[PDB]
Design a protein around this ligand. Structure first.
Ligand SMILES: *[C@@H]1O[C@H](CO)[C@@H](O[C@@H]2O[C@H](CO)[C@@H](O[C@@H]3O[C@H](CO[C@H]4O[C@H](CO)[C@@H](O)[C@H](O)[C@@H]4O)[C@@H](O)[C@H](O[C@H]4O[C@H](CO)[C@@H](O)[C@H](O)[C@@H]4O[C@H]4O[C@H](CO)[C@@H](O)[C@H](O)[C@@H]4O)[C@@H]3O)[C@H](O)[C@H]2NC(C)=O)[C@H](O)[C@H]1NC(C)=O
Ligand SMILES: *[C@@H]1O[C@H](CO)[C@@H](O[C@@H]2O[C@H](CO)[C@@H](O[C@@H]3O[C@H](CO[C@H]4O[C@H](CO)[C@@H](O)[C@H](O)[C@@H]4O)[C@@H](O)[C@H](O[C@H]4O[C@H](CO)[C@@H](O)[C@H](O)[C@@H]4O)[C@@H]3O)[C@H](O)[C@H]2NC(C)=O)[C@H](O)[C@H]1NC(C)=O
Ligand SMILES: *[C@@H]1O[C@H](CO)[C@@H](O[C@@H]2O[C@H](CO)[C@@H](O[C@@H]3O[C@H](CO[C@H]4O[C@H](CO)[C@@H](O)[C@H](O)[C@@H]4O)[C@@H](O)[C@H](O[C@H]4O[C@H](CO)[C@@H](O)[C@H](O)[C@@H]4O)[C@@H]3O)[C@H](O)[C@H]2NC(C)=O)[C@H](O)[C@H]1NC(C)=O
Ligand SMILES: *[C@@H]1O[C@H](CO)[C@@H](O[C@@H]2O[C@H](CO)[C@@H](O[C@@H]3O[C@H](CO[C@H]4O[C@H](CO)[C@@H](O)[C@H](O)[C@@H]4O)[C@@H](O)[C@H](O[C@H]4O[C@H](CO)[C@@H](O)[C@H](O)[C@@H]4O)[C@@H]3O)[C@H](O)[C@H]2NC(C)=O)[C@H](O)[C@H]1NC(C)=O
Ligand SMILES: *[C@@H]1O[C@H](CO)[C@@H](O[C@@H]2O[C@H](CO)[C@@H](O[C@@H]3O[C@H](CO)[C@@H](O)[C@H](O)[C@@H]3O)[C@H](O)[C@H]2NC(C)=O)[C@H](O)[C@H]1NC(C)=O
Ligand SMILES: *[C@@H]1O[C@H](CO)[C@@H](O[C@@H]2O[C@H](CO)[C@@H](O[C@@H]3O[C@H](CO)[C@@H](O)[C@H](O)[C@@H]3O)[C@H](O)[C@H]2NC(C)=O)[C@H](O)[C@H]1NC(C)=O
Ligand SMILES: *[C@@H]1O[C@H](CO)[C@@H](O[C@@H]2O[C@H](CO)[C@@H](O[C@@H]3O[C@H](CO)[C@@H](O)[C@H](O)[C@@H]3O)[C@H](O)[C@H]2NC(C)=O)[C@H](O)[C@H]1NC(C)=O
Ligand SMILES: *[C@@H]1O[C@H](CO)[C@@H](O[C@@H]2O[C@H](CO)[C@@H](O)[C@H](O)[C@H]2NC(C)=O)[C@H](O)[C@H]1NC(C)=O
Ligand SMILES: *[C@@H]1O[C@H](CO)[C@@H](O[C@@H]2O[C@H](CO)[C@@H](O)[C@H](O)[C@H]2NC(C)=O)[C@H](O)[C@H]1NC(C)=O
Ligand SMILES: *[C@@H]1O[C@H](CO)[C@@H](O[C@@H]2O[C@H](CO)[C@@H](O)[C@H](O)[C@H]2NC(C)=O)[C@H](O)[C@H]1NC(C)=O
Ligand SMILES: *[C@@H]1O[C@H](CO)[C@@H](O[C@@H]2O[C@H](CO)[C@@H](O)[C@H](O)[C@H]2NC(C)=O)[C@H](O)[C@H]1NC(C)=O
Ligand SMILES: *[C@@H]1O[C@H](CO)[C@@H](O[C@@H]2O[C@H](CO)[C@@H](O)[C@H](O)[C@H]2NC(C)=O)[C@H](O)[C@H]1NC(C)=O
Ligand SMILES: *[C@@H]1O[C@H](CO)[C@@H](O[C@@H]2O[C@H](CO)[C@@H](O)[C@H](O)[C@H]2NC(C)=O)[C@H](O)[C@H]1NC(C)=O
Ligand SMILES: *[C@@H]1O[C@H](CO)[C@@H](O[C@@H]2O[C@H](CO)[C@@H](O)[C@H](O)[C@H]2NC(C)=O)[C@H](O)[C@H]1NC(C)=O
Ligand SMILES: *[C@@H]1O[C@H](CO)[C@@H](O[C@@H]2O[C@H](CO)[C@@H](O)[C@H](O)[C@H]2NC(C)=O)[C@H](O)[C@H]1NC(C)=O
Ligand SMILES: *[C@@H]1O[C@H](CO)[C@@H](O[C@@H]2O[C@H](CO)[C@@H](O)[C@H](O)[C@H]2NC(C)=O)[C@H](O)[C@H]1NC(C)=O
Ligand SMILES: *[C@@H]1O[C@H](CO)[C@@H](O)[C@H](O)[C@H]1NC(C)=O
Lengths: 451, 53, 42
């Protein structure tokens, strides 16, 4: 028979693509008026009733390890933090000689030498006058020059003090696609991050993603619906990190019990430096606590899921971190504005062979000079928070690394890992992909154009 | 052909946090005038062509 | 060990300079080309 080309405009066809998504937030942040970086510089109001269309018959290939959404989110968060820090105070004058003594006023043995009482000369609002002041500095934030100390950052760069009016608390962020692009979502319960998905949908915006910055433990994230999920770009390659998603959260209570006082020191015209004035009461180690039974059950489930890839009879070892700097060797996070680094050796100290409120306690240290994003030369100073700090969070996942193993295959040991925040974003964006619409189609019909 | 024959040493001086000033530390050997060289015949021919034009 | 044509072209200049610590000064020296410096009033 006679067939002719026919053109269709607006056909449902798409290809894998990369683009620039935009971000949306709920009105609640606008009602806080605490100047959240995301709601202030990047995001717009969220749609009251987001649209989700379920694509019947559609099976789509996903790969969470080659998703540009993660890269865009990493770049966006870094840029927003830098932008929020631009108008803040630069602590150049703070790079001076410090005369430091111990703080032995009712301290515990574990907190001996952790805090230092440092006196120094500082500039005033008058360029021709100097003021002798004192402050308390954490042992990690100072280094001995030769009783003489200097700030750790003084030989690398000057730190920018965080503006107390700016809030970095994670508020949910939705990523939304512009014209000509779509976001596809995999709703399979046992989707491992790579391969086909048979239950696909298209969404205007992603679900509320909280950009939580943490290491060795994913906090306040999404949970698996059926069972614990193990995800890795290549499980057999020990050099690739493993992302573990829990089906039930694990409560973690972190606290700084020391009652701290914030003191303002005028270092220039309109320039104030917020230091630690004094400690009211005794000095105790900040610490985190998790239930022993819940952690043991979660580790058992994780081991059960790992044995599907590493053998039903292989011995599984959970050991602490190998080495590196404080950020990677410790569970690092932000509690009420203070930067905690906690020792997780008590969490990964187990053996499994394939055969009640003890409340595991993790000691923690606190830092004020912060190097984020694994960068160098852009240090940030965190002003102290007045009072006693307590936060409660949910461990929803882990980042793990496997040792080489020597190919013996008899045993496998896993250690907490992290550092690169891109894995944290992948833990939430694994189910999303971006596609570009191709609206033009050509097909045969019996329709023929007039002459 | 242009040349600086003096063997120069670069010295870093820390003038602030993360701020380094790169100065001339010392000269290894004798100090000679930097200079350029061009062939006399080639330049003369080129100038002759320029004059002709 | 300079040549006659390069006499006075280079100068050995000592000066006090700031350090990474705002309250400390370091005495340093450098070599400066004659064209990059001007006499104030050695
Ligand atoms: C995982 O998710 C959980 C829950 O989502 C989260 O825990 C939450 O953490 C946030 C921040 O750490 C908590 O919010 C703070 O809560 C304290 C405690 O106040 C309680 O009681 C008041 C009474 O009205 C309630 O309104 C309040 O909601 C709490 O129930 C507040 O004091 C905090 O507000 C102060 O700080 C804010 C930020 O600085 C200021 O914007 C605010 O104006 C308040 O200012 C105070 O501090 C200033 C210095 O910072 C000072 O200058 C002021 O004068 C004033 O003193 C803040 O609202 C929240 O309660 C937690 N929720 C639960 C259930 O625990 C985890 O943190 C999260 N995990 C991670 C890793 O992110
Ligand atoms: C970190 O380091 C700084 C500096 O070293 C410490 O600051 C010092 O704290 C001590 C103790 O509080 C101060 O000494 C005390 O000052 C009290 C306040 O009096 C002021 O006014 C009087 C009258 O003009 C002055 O003589 C005096 O110097 C102060 O300027 C005094 O009342 C205290 O003496 C009286 O009370 C005590 C306690 O009851 C008695 O034992 C005495 O006999 C007397 O009756 C005492 O002199 C000191 O002045 C502070 N220095 C500065 C520069 O501020 C921080 O405490 C320290 N912090 C930590 C955590 O270690
Ligand atoms: C996920 O991660 C795993 C683990 O890293 C990868 O598996 C590795 O794959 C590589 C490449 O195929 C393997 O290396 C190759 O092994 C071949 C088999 O030889 C075995 O025995 C010899 C004995 O001497 C060992 O040296 C060797 O490592 C193997 O154990 C070799 O024949 C290959 O040699 C040839 O290729 C190399 C590389 O081009 C050349 O340099 C050589 O001259 C030669 O031409 C090669 O060495 C590796 O052994 C695998 N490891 C394991 C544990 O299985 C997966 O590939 C990865 N998956 C994805 C998708 O990336
Ligand atoms: C620009 O200007 C600067 C400053 O004026 C010059 O820097 C000086 O250079 C001279 C010559 O090199 C230095 O003097 C020499 O220092 C040598 C290094 O020794 C050091 O340690 C000893 C022991 O602690 C100290 O005593 C000494 O001061 C140094 O700190 C000495 O070894 C030299 O003496 C010995 O060797 C010579 C040569 O063999 C013998 O003749 C002596 O008898 C003795 O055995 C000599 O003292 C001087 O220290 C430098 N000053 C600074 C501040 O660095 C630059 O050289 C100049 N550059 C140019 C291009 O003009
Ligand atoms: C803040 O600045 C003041 C003034 O610069 C510092 O005090 C000064 O400290 C120096 C060094 O200790 C004193 O010089 C020394 O004096 C002793 C005698 O006490 C003498 O033996 C030494 O040879 C040396 O000359 C100087 O006199 C002193 N000036 C004062 C007290 O007015 C102070 O130390 C600075 N504070 C901090 C925390 O750095
Ligand atoms: C990781 O796990 C191991 C094994 O559970 C821990 O080592 C064990 O720690 C317990 C508690 O400290 C030890 O029991 C103690 O024994 C001493 C000596 O008999 C006794 O005086 C105490 O009263 C207590 O009963 C146990 O012996 C010890 N075992 C080994 C092999 O070292 C280890 O501490 C854990 N690490 C972390 C960081 O939690
Ligand atoms: C770097 O700074 C130091 C200290 O400011 C300078 O040394 C100082 O130089 C002045 C002027 O030469 C000295 O004052 C003078 O002292 C002489 C006695 O030697 C006296 O007769 C004068 O009336 C005048 O008071 C001062 O004492 C001296 N201080 C020291 C050496 O500690 C140095 O010159 C500076 N370097 C450069 C390259 O500018
Ligand atoms: C001041 O603090 C420093 C740092 O903690 C103390 O130095 C340590 O002191 C203990 C106790 O004598 C020694 O065992 C250590 O070897 C010292 N060095 C380190 C690196 O810990 C110092 O003793 C304290 N001094 C006072 C008077 O409290
Ligand atoms: C940590 O996880 C617990 C349990 O999932 C959360 O508590 C529940 O929160 C939901 C919120 O919709 C409530 O509907 C439930 O009633 C709460 N209790 C239980 C037993 O599920 C808690 O909110 C989580 N905390 C954070 C910070 O995410
Ligand atoms: C995630 O699941 C996919 C399949 O749904 C896995 O990919 C298969 O891996 C096996 C080896 O275990 C191969 O033989 C198949 O050819 C692969 N097929 C496809 C379509 O990829 C993938 O390995 C899983 N990833 C994990 C468990 O990390
Ligand atoms: C931390 O220290 C401050 C200051 O000492 C405490 O504030 C006092 O609170 C009591 C009531 O608990 C009041 O009667 C005082 O007037 C307050 N003093 C002030 C504000 O200077 C605060 O309660 C302490 N917090 C904790 C948890 O101990
Ligand atoms: C973390 O803190 C919460 C409270 O913020 C603790 O929950 C309490 O647990 C005790 C003992 O089970 C109960 O008696 C209280 O009623 C609970 N209060 C609540 C739920 O608001 C929780 O036990 C702590 N977890 C630790 C210390 O591991
Ligand atoms: C975290 O806690 C563990 C145990 O509580 C500490 O382990 C000790 O580490 C020292 C220093 O290398 C070893 O000599 C001891 O064998 C360990 N003791 C125990 C109880 O196992 C570990 O030091 C802590 N991490 C850091 C870096 O402080
Ligand atoms: C310029 O000076 C440097 C330093 O004096 C010379 O570097 C030396 O080179 C020789 C080989 O020619 C080595 O044996 C020395 O170990 C080097 N010393 C260093 C690097 O400190 C350099 O050769 C000189 N260049 C010229 C063109 O003379
Ligand atoms: C500029 O330098 C080049 C070399 O970089 C000189 O070229 C050399 O010339 C001599 C003499 O004619 C030859 O023996 C060499 O073989 C050449 N080397 C090359 C071409 O690599 C050139 O003569 C110089 N010109 C001047 C000094 O005017
Ligand atoms: C230091 O350098 C200056 C600048 O070249 C010298 O000043 C000249 O010295 C020559 C030689 O005596 C005189 O002929 C000139 O008149 C001077 N002035 C100028 C502008 O060239 C000075 O002599 C040098 N001194 C030493 C000790 O080397
Ligand atoms: C891990 O545990 C061992 C043994 O207790 C200890 O020597 C090592 O320092 C620990 N590593 C970290 C990063 O805490």
């Amino acid at each position: 028979e006679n067939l002719w080309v026919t053109v269709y405009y607006g056909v449902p066809v798409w290809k894998d693509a990369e683009t620039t998504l935009f971000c949306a937030s709920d009105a609640k942040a606008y009602e806080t008026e605490k100047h959240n970086v995301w709601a202030t510089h990047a995001c717009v109001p969220t749609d009251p009733n987001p649209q989700e269309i379920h694509l019947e018959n559609v099976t789509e290939e996903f790969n969470m390890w080659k998703n540009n959404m993660v890269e865009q989110m990493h770049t966006d968060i870094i840029s927003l933090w830098d932008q929020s820090l631009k108008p803040c105070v630069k602590l150049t004058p703070l790079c001076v000689t410090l005369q430091c003594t111990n703080v032995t006023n009712n301290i515990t043995d574990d907190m001996r030498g952790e805090l230092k009482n440092c006196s120094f000369n500082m500039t005033t609002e008058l360029r021709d006058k100097k003021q002798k002041v004192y402050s308390l500095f954490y042992r990690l934030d100072v280094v001995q020059i030769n009783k003489e100390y200097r700030l750790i950052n003084c030989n690398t760069s000057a730190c920018t003090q965080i503006c107390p009016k700016v809030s970095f608390e994670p508020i949910p962020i939705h990523y939304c696609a512009p014209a000509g692009f779509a976001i596809l979502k995999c709703k399979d319960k046992k989707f491992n991050g790579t391969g086909p998905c048979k239950n696909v949908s298209t969404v205007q915006c992603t679900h509320g993603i909280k950009p939580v910055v943490s290491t060795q433990l994913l906090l306040n994230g999404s949970l698996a619906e059926e069972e614990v999920m193990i995800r890795s770009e290549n499980i057999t390659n020990n050099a690739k990190n493993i992302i573990v998603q829990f089906n039930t959260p694990v409560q973690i209570n972190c606290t700084r019990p020391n009652n701290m006082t914030r003191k303002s020191i005028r270092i220039g015209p309109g320039q104030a430096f917020y230091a630690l004035g004094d400690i009211i009461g005794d000095i105790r180690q900040p610490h985190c606590t998790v239930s022993k039974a819940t952690w043991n059950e979660t580790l058992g489930k994780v081991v059960k899921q790992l044995r599907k890839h590493f053998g039903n009879n292989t011995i599984i070892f959970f050991a602490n971190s190998s080495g590196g700097d404080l950020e990677v060797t410790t569970h690092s996070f932000n509690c009420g504005g203070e930067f905690f680094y906690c020792n997780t050796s008590g969490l990964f100290n187990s053996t499994w062979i394939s055969n009640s409120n003890d409340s595991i306690t993790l000691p923690c240290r606190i830092k004020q000079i912060i190097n984020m994003w694994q960068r160098v030369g852009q240090c940030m100073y965190a002003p102290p928070i007045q009072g006693v700090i307590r936060c409660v969070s949910n461990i929803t996942g882990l980042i793990l690394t496997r040792d080489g193993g020597s190919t013996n295959s008899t045993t496998e040991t896993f250690r907490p890992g992290g550092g690169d925040m891109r894995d944290n974003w992948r833990s939430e964006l694994y189910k999303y992909k971006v596609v570009k619409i191709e609206p033009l189609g050509v097909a045969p019909t019996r329709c023929k154009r007039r002459v």
